Amino acid sequence: GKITVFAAASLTNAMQDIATQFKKEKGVDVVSSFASSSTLARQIEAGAPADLFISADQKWMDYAVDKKAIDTATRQTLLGNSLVVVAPKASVQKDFTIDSKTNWTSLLNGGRLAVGDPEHVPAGIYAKEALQKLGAWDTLSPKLAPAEDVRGALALVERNEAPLGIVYGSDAVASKGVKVVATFPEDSHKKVEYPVAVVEGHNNATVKAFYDYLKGPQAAEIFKRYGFTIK
Q: Which domain of life is it from?
């Protein structure tokens, strides 16, 4: 048959490679839809026919679980990731540390900070939480350049439309146009975690085969190569 996966935008490259490999190995077609985890969870709630859902945070998975849209026995934390600051490849921006006394204003220089919409995109929620903990939020809120998902924020930095952007470590690995210039301290935000679960009513042998494949060695190889930490 055919499997439909709704996955956080940050999983774009890894998921495409995994789907290709699975088709080679088992002969089944895997179609993925990528967007902010918030958007995907609301689509699942509305009745969009996805078989699997992989969120970039626990929050949006919990959301789908409460709407009775998830086969809960299948929910499991699959990946981890880091939160970093990127700049265009050709920027002269040098590495810097992120602490209570980081001067964001001079780093930006009249430019904007690209972020996933902190209102609902997981990347933006982790970022806001970190900037609030570090006391820089009040200063940065008027300087944001929000985007539809983390890849939208990444694109702004790649196209040199924003000097700095907050994305996942994995996004930097997949991007040929940016470079990591700082890494958020692990204690500044909730641990970045990706839960996976089968959508309610879609737990059949074909979907289960792919779900098991995601926790296997071939998939772990691809995830590691793209910068994700395997939980």
A: Bacteria
Residue with tokens 């992120």: 98
Residue 150 assigned to a binding site: yes
Cα–Cα distance for residue pair 65/72, rounded to 1 Å: 7
The technique by which this structure was obtained is X-ray
Output Rg (C-alpha) for the chain, integer angstroms: 18
Phi/psi at 131 (5° precision): -65, -30
Residues 195, 196, 201, 206, Cα dihedral to 10°: -170
Identify the CATH number of the domain in which residue 163 sits: 3.40.190.10
Domain count across the chain:
2
Q: Is 226 annotated as a binding residue?
A: no
Residue 24: domain span: 1-80+193-231
Tokens of 178: 């940016």
To the question of whether residue 32 is assigned a binding role by annotation, the answer is no
Q: What is the resolution of this structure in A?
A: 1.8
Query: Edge-to-edge strand order for the sheet containing 29-35?
Result: 29-35, 2-8, 52-54, 192-198, 76-81, 229-230
Phi/psi of residue 125, each to 5°? -65, -45
Q: CB within 8 A of 197, min separation 6: which ones?
A: 52, 53, 61, 64, 65, 70, 71, 72, 74, 75, 76
Please tell me the distance from the alpha carbon of residue 33 to that of residue 199, in angstroms, as a whole number: 14
Same domain (yes/no): 166, 91: yes
Main-chain dihedrals φ then ψ at residue 98, nearest 5 degrees: -115, 110
